[PDB]
Amino acid sequence: MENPHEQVQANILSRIIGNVKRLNESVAILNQELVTINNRNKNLEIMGAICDNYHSSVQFNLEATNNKKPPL
Amino acid sequence: MDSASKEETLEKLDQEITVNLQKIDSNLSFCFHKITQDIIPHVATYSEICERIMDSTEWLGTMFQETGLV
Amino acid sequence: TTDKYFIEQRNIVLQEINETMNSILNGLNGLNISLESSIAVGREFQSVSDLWKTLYDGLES
Amino acid sequence: NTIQQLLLPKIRELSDSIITLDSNFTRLNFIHESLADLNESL
């Protein structure tokens, strides 16, 4: 009557569409998670920046006055 | 070439299309499993670790805020 | 003061309950996705089984 | 009051998931019977 493979391809493609939709939803959720984490951690680069600035500042001061003593 | 074999070749194309579709489905399902079961939990673990970071150093944060009005 | 402490214990246990139920829902959702994938790939077997019912079925006849 | 309300949605999605899981297992049982019949014939 009808080509046997037609229904097979129909079902296979339908399932492919379904799981690709699942993939899209999963990656969208992942993107939301990453955005949340970045916004939350936006304090950490501030922390790191001021810490690095303090380190450079104390090193420069130990250069300006010669209190920098030999290593151990 | 042959007529019986040319109908055979049409059927070959049908078989190859089916098996390629099956392989594609398997690959996409593996990708979905990798995303859902591995990548997202590790992202969540990294989130928890970074939260513990910012929690442990909050005493420095509050000092710097008290004098810098940041 | 005691009522406040009661309330804060409530909030603590409720938030941990919320996160645990989150975990439960996510696990069940993943399991359901996998199961429905199994069903989707399996549904085609009914037709071939029905075709092979013509050779041997046993109790039915 | 509002706190039992805070809970009730969670049990609601739990109920929805459990109902879906039940239906999925019934469908899987149908598939299992089909597989058994095919196995017996072959």
């Binding site: 379904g18 939709k21 699942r22 939803e25 999963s26 959720i29 998670e33 | 859902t36 997202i40 | 938030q15 919320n18 989150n22 829902l25 996510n26 959702n29 993943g30 359901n32 996705i33 429905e36 | 805070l6 999605e13 998931s17 879906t20």
Partner: peptide, 11 residues
């Protein structure tokens, strides 16, 4: 009637 990946988070 097909479940969709919906990771719940927070409250």
């Amino acid at each position: 009637s097909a479940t969709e990946y919906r990771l719940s988070i927070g409250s």
